[PDB]
Amino acid sequence: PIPPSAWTGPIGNVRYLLPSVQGPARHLYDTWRAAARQIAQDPQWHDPLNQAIMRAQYVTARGGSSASLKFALKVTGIVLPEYDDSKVKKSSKIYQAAQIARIAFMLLIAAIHAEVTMGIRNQVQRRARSIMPLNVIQQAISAPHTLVANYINKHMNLSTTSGSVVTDKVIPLILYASTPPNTVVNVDIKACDASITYNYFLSVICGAMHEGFEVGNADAAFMGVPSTIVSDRRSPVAPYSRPISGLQTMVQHLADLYAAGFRYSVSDAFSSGNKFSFPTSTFPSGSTATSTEHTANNSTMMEYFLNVHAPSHVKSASLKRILTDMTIQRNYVCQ
Amino acid sequence: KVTPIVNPSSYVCNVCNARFSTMSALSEHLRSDHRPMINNAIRSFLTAWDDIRILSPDVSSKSLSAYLDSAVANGPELIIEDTGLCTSFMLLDNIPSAHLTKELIGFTWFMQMYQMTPPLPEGAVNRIVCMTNWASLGDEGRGLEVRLPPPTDSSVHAYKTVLSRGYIDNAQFNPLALRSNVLLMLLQFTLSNLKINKSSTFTSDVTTITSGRMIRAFEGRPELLALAYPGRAVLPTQTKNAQFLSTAIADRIGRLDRANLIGGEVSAMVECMELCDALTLHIRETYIMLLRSMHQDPTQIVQIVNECANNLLNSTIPISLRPTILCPWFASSEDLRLQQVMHLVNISSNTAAALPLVEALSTLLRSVTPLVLDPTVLTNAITTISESTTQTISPISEILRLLQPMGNDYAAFWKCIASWAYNGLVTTVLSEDAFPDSSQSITHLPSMWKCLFLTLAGPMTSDPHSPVKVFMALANLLAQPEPIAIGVPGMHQTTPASQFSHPGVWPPGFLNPQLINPQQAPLLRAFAEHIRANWPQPSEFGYGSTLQGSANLFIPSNRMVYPWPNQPLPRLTVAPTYDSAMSNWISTTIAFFIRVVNSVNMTATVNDLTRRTMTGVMTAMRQVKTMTPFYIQHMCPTELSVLASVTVTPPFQVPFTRLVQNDVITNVLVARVDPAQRGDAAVDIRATHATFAAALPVDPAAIVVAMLCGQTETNLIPSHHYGKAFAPLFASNAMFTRNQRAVITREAFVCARSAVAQCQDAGFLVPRPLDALRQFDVTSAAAAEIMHAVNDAFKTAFDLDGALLDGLALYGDPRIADLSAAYLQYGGNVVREHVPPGPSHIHRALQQVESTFMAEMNLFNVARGNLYLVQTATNGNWSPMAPVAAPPFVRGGPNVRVVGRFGTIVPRPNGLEPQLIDDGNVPRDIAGDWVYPSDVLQVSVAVFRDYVWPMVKAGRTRVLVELGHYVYTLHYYDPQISLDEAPILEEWLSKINPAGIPPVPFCIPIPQVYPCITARRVHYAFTSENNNDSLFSTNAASIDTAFGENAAVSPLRWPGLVDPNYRVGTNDLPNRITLYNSLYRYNFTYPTLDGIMYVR
Amino acid sequence: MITIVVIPTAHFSWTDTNFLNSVDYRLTSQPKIRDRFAVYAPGWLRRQLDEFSASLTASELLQALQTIPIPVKREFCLTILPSLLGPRTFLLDVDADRDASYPLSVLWPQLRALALKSRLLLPPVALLRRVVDPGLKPTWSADSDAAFRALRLSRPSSASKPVGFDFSALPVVDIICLLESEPDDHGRIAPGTRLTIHSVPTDLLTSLSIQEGVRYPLRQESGMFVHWVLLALLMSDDVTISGTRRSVKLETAHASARPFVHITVERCASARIIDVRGSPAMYANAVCLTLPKGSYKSTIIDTLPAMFSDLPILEQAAVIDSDALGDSLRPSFETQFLERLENLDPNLLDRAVASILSPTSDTSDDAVTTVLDAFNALYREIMTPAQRARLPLLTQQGRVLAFAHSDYELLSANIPIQVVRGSIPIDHVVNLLARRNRVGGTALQVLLDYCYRTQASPLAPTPAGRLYKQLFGPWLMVPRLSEPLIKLRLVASAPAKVLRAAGWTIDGDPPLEVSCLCAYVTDRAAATALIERRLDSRALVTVGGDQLMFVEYAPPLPLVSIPRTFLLPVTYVVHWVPPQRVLLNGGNVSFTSGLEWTFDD
Ligand SMILES: [Zn+2]
Secondary structure: OOOHHHEEEEEOOEEEEOOOOOOHHHHHHHHHHHHHHHHHOOOOOOOHHHHHHHHHHHHHHOOOOOOOOOOOOOOOOOOOOOOOOOOOOOOHHHHHHHHHOOOOOOOOHHHOOOOOOEOOOOOOOOOOOOOOOOOHHHHOOOHHHHHHHHHHOOOOOOOOOOOOOHHHHHHHHHHHOOOOOOOOOOOOOOOOHHHOOOOOHHHHHHHHHHHHOOOOOOOOOEOOEOOEEEEEOOOOOOOEEEEEOHHHHHHHHHHHHHHHOOOEEEOOOOOOOOOEEEOOOOOOOOOOOOOHHHHHHHHHHHHHHHHHHHHHHOOOOOHHHHHHOOOOOOOOOOO | OOOOOOOOOOEEOOOOOOEEOOHHHHHHHHHHHHOOHHHHHHHHHHHOOOOOOOOOOOOOOOOOOOOOHHHHHOOOOOOOEEOOOOOOEEEEEEEOHHHOOOOOOOOEOOOHHHOOOOOOOOOOEEEEEEEOOOOOOOOOOOOOOOEOOOOOOOOOHHHOOOOOOOOOOOOOEOOOEHHHHHHHHHHHHHHHHOOEEEOOOEEEOOOOOOOOOEEEOOOOOHHHHHHHOHHHOOOOOOOHHHHHHOOOOOOOOEEOOOEOOOOOOOOOEEOEEEOOOHHHHHHHHHHHHHHHOOOOOHHHHHHHHHHHOOOOOOEEOOOOOOOOOOOOOOOOHHHHHHHHHHHHHHOOOOHHHHHHHHHHHHHHHHHOOOOEEOOHHHHHHHOOOOOOOOOOOOOOHHHHOOOOOOOOOOHHHHHHHHOHHHOOOEEEEEOHHHOOOOOOOOOOHHHHHHHHHHHHOOOOOOOOOHHHHHHHHHHHHOOOOOOOOOOOOOOOOOOOOOOOOOHHHOOHHHHOHHHOOOOOOHHHHHHHHHHHHHOOOOOEEEOOOOOOOOOOOOOOOOEEEOOOOOOOOOOOOOOOOOOOHHHHHHHHHHHHHHHHHOOOHHHHHOOHHHHHHHHHHHHHHHOOOOOHHHHHHHHHHHHHHHOOOOOOOOOOOOOOOOOOOOOOEEEEEEEOOOOOOOOOOOOOHHHHOEEOOEEEEEOHHHHHHHHHOEEOOOOOOHHHHHHHHOHHHOOOHHHHHHHHHHHHHHHHHHHHHHHHHHHOOOOOOOOOOOOOOOEOOOOHHHHHHHHHHHHHHHHHHOOOOOOOOOOOOOOOOOOOOOOEEEEEEOOOOEOOOOOOOOOOOHHHHHHHHHHHHHHOHHHHOEEEOOEEEEEEEEOOOOOOOOOOOOOOOOOOOOOEEEEOOOOOEEOOOOOOOOEEEEOOOOEEEOOOEEEEEHHHHHHOHHHHHHHHHHHHHOOOOEEEEEOOEEEEEEEEEOOOOOOEOHHHHHHHHOOOOOOOEOOEEEEEEOOOOOOOOOOOEEEEEEEOOOOOOOEEEOOOOEOOOOOOOOOOOOOOOOHHHHOOOOOOOOOOOOOOOOOOEEOOEEOOOOOOOOOOOEEO | OEEEEEOOEOOEOOOOOOHHHHHOHHHHOOHHHHOOEEEEOOHHHHHHHHHOOOOOOHHHHHHHHOOOOOOOOOOEEEEOOOOOOOOOOEEEOOOOOEOOOOHHHHHHHHHHHHHHOOOOEEOHHHHOOOOOOOOOOOOOOOOOOOOOOOOOOOOOOOOOOOOOOOOOEEEEEEEEEEEEEOOOOOOOOOOOEEEEEEEEEOHHHHHOOOOOOOEEEOEOOOOOEOHHHHHHHHOOOOEEOOOOOOEOOEOOOOOOOOOEEEEEEEEEEEOOEEEOOOOOOOEOOEEEEEOOOOOOHHHHHHHHHHHOOOOOOOOHHHEEOHHHHHOOOOOOHHHHHHHHHHOOOOHHHHHHHHHHOOOOOOOOOOOHHHHHHHHHHHHHHHHHHHHHHOHHHHHOOOEEEEEEOOOOHHHHOOOOOOEEEEEOOEOOOOHHHHOOOOOOHHHHHHHHHHHHHHHOOOOOOEEHHHHHHHHOOOOOOOOOOOOOOEEEEOOOOEOOOOOOOOOOOOOOOOOEOEEOOEEEEOOOOOOHHHHOOOEEEEEEEEEOOOOOEEEEEOOOOEHHHOOOOOEOOOOEOOEEOOOOOOOOOOOOOOEEEEEOOEEOO
């Protein structure tokens, strides 16, 4: 585990990793930082069509779980249309995002943390199973964590978003592997969704994204989240109030959301009326826009293994000759 | 329950039923019960622990240096005023005469009896203790202060400020780090005291005490009015204060010359006499002299703002008089250089630092620019060329594939411009994924249009190897038809044009196109003929104002080099013209690739009708009327001149180079350590300096869209469009914040490199007034605590938030702190433009405090001279601090013996006395006169206390304790009651460790008012040098002291009050401190920029 | 005339209250000082800035609002919008943090830097004077009027009186204390150190009746602090030296020679009103405070309702101590931690005590990392499955205040509870040395101190006093409230058919109800707008086979859901409202029911 002395003073909620620690956490901290630097530089955002694609990405991809705007009337008075005069399903696809168009994000992101965040359609007993995706405005506060994970997988995992990518990329790699020239190690990571916690991982990346988003304009909004005051506590003699960008504002709320966990609410119609919401450190399984972060760590943590860890830790002198010129751009493919 | 009113007289341990009269006794016994290896770390954690102090030299925050746009944006507090009176020495009464046991009527008289507060203290011991700002009722005190307790207390926590926490316990001071702790207190004495003296209000003395003198009107606080003015004392009886205050001259009080200017307006500067030391007043007047040094008059600051805005901003000043107008915002050109290197020392020298810094411009650069990109024009220019659709390959369609980014992706052009101000840190590199590969030929069509896009976007990117990559990307692409010779072996012609990033692998044909044969490679010589003739000329222009200065290091000041031959800004309606060097560069590439398309190699493969299409596209691309050739030449150098002084960091430039082999800037270098102190003066400059490795992969496909397709509003007045856009970012004085940063960056740098080199032995050329003091630990980590604590004080006194002086301990040796900068050229030009500090003011102030510390060490609870331990059983007066007799047995005297390094008693058998090893390694007998060094007595203390200290109590030996300077703690007693100093002095011996010593317990009798009978008493400890320099008055409220010393109020402390020969404006400042002086108070108004000028 | 721009602090009360109070309630003390302040904080401009914040960047958001003059008078004009900071107008600093929710709060480092260059920012004590002199302690004011002393009641109530008392609004004094050491044999003293307790409630200082300018004893007979200052230290946000900005944590006793034995409270630095709704706590059922070992949890569990016994603050059975869950097992967790360490190595324990208590820490890859993996193997074996069995005690009662040693067990054992990460400004590492006669001694207290510190997730520890202002804050109102309050409660009614299924001797045809959560209102009419409507949350009530009985809500109820005039307790246990109606319990059957606030008589 990372020692508490290895962290800096807090910048708001997040902390930075000291350079004095140089384990595999540092290469985690330094890959997610530089990938976060290439987004505050990237002018693909503040483009109206690019912002319309990301909001379309949360609605269309998954069927959604809940309506926590009934919970999010607690700080802002909403008229709460039930939409029984429109016959439409009250799932998170349509019933949430239509009501988001009235209220800005900044009057909502300060009070997003819900216990029935996800799992069931705004009622504790229905006929549906407790399922994976969460609120569209808590996916919107998880938006940079998707984007920095997309930049790690951009130069490595050219998936190209095509309907034929198993039969074009996976199948010939399957056939190029197992050939009599090369022997392979099919590396599988079991329970990877329940292996990304704030205790180790989500504290490092939220510190890496926050130092990575320090580049660029500190006075710059992002997707409707304005710049704000952070409370800097790094210097023990000089704490002060810093303006941080909206891209760093989302990481301040994301650190509060990752550390409290993810509130799975079980409301299955199989057992007679068992019903409880509870946190976990487990990511949703089938969310490909969120499970790409597991791809973002799979190539990254194999890269520290094949170059720094295993060429120093292994005792076989012959194997160090093999591990010298192994490279994840040549010798490791992940998805 | 009801809250307690009084502390418990008896403290319980609750472990054992042990009553304690003092909480300090309970604090040790609870600590005693906590105590193998486990309890030692538990006892030490309760021993060396305290966090209540402000300074933390032991907390070494690892890599706290991180530059921020908001860190400089908070300015330091300079204008902190002092409405009260500027003295640092309060006249503290240790022993009131009410504590005297015998009290008869009329011997002592108090002013409290007459409902009046005394001006001078009234007791039986009055010391002058250093308590800063005790009377300072100015606004918003400086944070750090030093408040020494009186000599009756311990007074060592003021001298544990560095090198002392973990090493020695609380009751001691570290004498081998004493010069560090004293001098760091003096820095804490100075920076606590950098205020501005402000006149409060002046009434006439309507009463009869001075009868009309313009008294300082302390309105709401009469408890300081009586202390400000001893001349207005009522003298009822013959108080010994009244013996002194009778000699007070009547007209030495209140204001003398109110230097007013305007009737009705507040005065500029009054000149009044009040109670103030001569030392604080010197610190105040050198602070105004610091504060005037960054002041400019408003006739000249409007010339600065207009020249900073290039005279296109409408800023007017009223021409009239303005009395009190300190507007302190102007560091010189030298001090901005010192912050600019300190900016480059704080940062990480990789690409993590310039990449925040480029977009600082590029956000503001896109905010103010008139150039509106609109790629429909170059699209409409290409899609309206004619092509038969029956072909397989479309040169129209296969190049718009290589043209369009999906997002905007056009701010990368503006990052490419903004890197020209920052070519020292970052060099924008042509993006390696945009080079055509070493697999496709020139017949492969999208590989050729990449080479057009590289050749067009060549001079935009600021990489020094840009034209050799432009030249090679075609020479790669036609390696089969046109072969040439490529440099050293290992780099062939089919090397993929990105590995030619070193000046040694430029091909010889590129340096000299005559080396390429036209009969062999005609198409490739003419591209070496192309680049060497049409690559743009690196011109230059000015920015900022010459009056303010600039933070240019390698460029001459207030200038900026620029990779294009600029022209001044037009004020009429502009139109896209083709006279630019851009249009010279653009038209000649198209004139070259019309030759490549219509060459012989493309003739044999590419069909003739689709060859006309490629010719038709480029000739259409050449004739696109775009504004960016006019923009980069005329309008863009104006806004790189304006935004270079409103962004948070000034431009750090290195001169551009058009294709010179020997002038390629390989490395740009900044060091934290000079090559003279460490023996590195002759080695290569890359080994002495740290190098800025930063790069930006600029995409050339987005440049050509920005370059060849850019337009502007038709009726553009570029003076008006810049005059309207720059107006919201000159209206504030926040532009002048970094000038206030740069002086505090200077004043902290000079005073920290002094404070390190004061504590070394003969470091930099700094004067060493405290060199008499003891300082042993001169290591790197010892001096790292010194610079970190000085850094911890300037961040506290001016209560700023940036990172000044951090990162000078990045390498870990701040004993060598010298800021240099250089850049190496491939020909071997080794420039080394290094920057010394400027003529600072606070470093002159601390140096004067250190000089007058030595004359009055006793005033800061530090006694000088050696220590005497002889048995002196007397009955009369006993003055340890002022020995009236001659000091006995000086070192080297008649049969005086000095103990060797171990402090070793050898035992002798059969009733023979134990012998002591002296300095000459000879065992000599105990009884006699001995000199002990301090460090010998720190380790021989158990041998001292058991073998030679009982020989002192018998009076048959006398021991000198040789040590230079030391904190003293005075102890007082009623001389009527008997006393023996040995329970008081063996407690001093019982805490001497090998690491430190306690302060020295001198026993002094309280001076009595009666000729009373006195007990015979035995004293041991007294000193050699006259160390009684802090005693103000021996006894005040009494009519006359009888038993003790008759040390009345010294008139040497008060020439300004009692001396008739006192001239106004004099002091004996390197000698003793005068406590009543004439001074100057101020009434400066502090205008904003709206209070100076008017900006529409 | 003089315009004073105010930027709101971190927990500014925009509630149904005065704007003057929420910046400095000293201004509303006297009528002649209330009338010297014209206020300008309109509601239309507050709504307008909340939607124009994300669109317009903060560099030119200043450029917009400075161009607006006096919009389309009294002495001082406290306004909410910035202006051109000329000599006639000013700015005020509170020496607090500026909030994140307020849109012009990001404009604070741009306005402050202009005020530093021209000496225009003025302390909040400068508003009380007759003429504006910017800065503390002037030459012309005595600074001794009763309007300066904010430790009195300052008369918050008058004839113009609202509907109900606001328990979300809370007076807070930034107090300046001088810590004074032991006097000499003569009446002499070292100068001592000044300290600023930044955010301590005033009603802790009025009920524990003190004045400022008078010396108080700091110590008890046992060496530990008096409960007066000790509550005021851990109600705080931060403790700094007064002149500077460096935070400081102070020991309790015997850790420093020459200790501090007196406090002369001398100056209220600022007198804000801090809101409660919007706390670090968000759920009315449960909140857990993760404090390190050596924190004074037992001081505020026991001794604070010992100082206030006439009024029900908390329920002792329904507050979970952190040390007690390791004491739940029949062998104690600290007793097994003796047995786990002793079986492996006695030598690494001899040098882990020196590396944890080191001033500077090395990698220590022999001493501490053998302790921690032995700790975590011991922890994962027993503590995480026991915490799952402790799930109904820590979230399923009416209202609980759980305590934890770290952030792990609240999340790893997957219990539904809001975790707040606490840091009190007392150095807890010397408290573990100060306490004695433990089961593992003082050596075991510092090893598993470091074990819970490494176990805790690295995130900013919020000041725990901000949590205690939500809990114990408005319970300091009721001694200065002149009106004896009334009692309310919730109802989860149960049918007799579900209460006769497994067997309960219950007399009566009307349904049996239960008290889920109580709350106190200072009148009756302020609850009449809320006693009528039912609450939109389903509440399932687990009734045990024994006397125990647990309540859960299908929809978690936001703490902010209750109105601002409710005084709900710190912790609360569930009981039947008639105990006598229940007889012959005989088994455990739960049921679901709605909620209605009602009057309890
Ligand atoms: Zn004891």
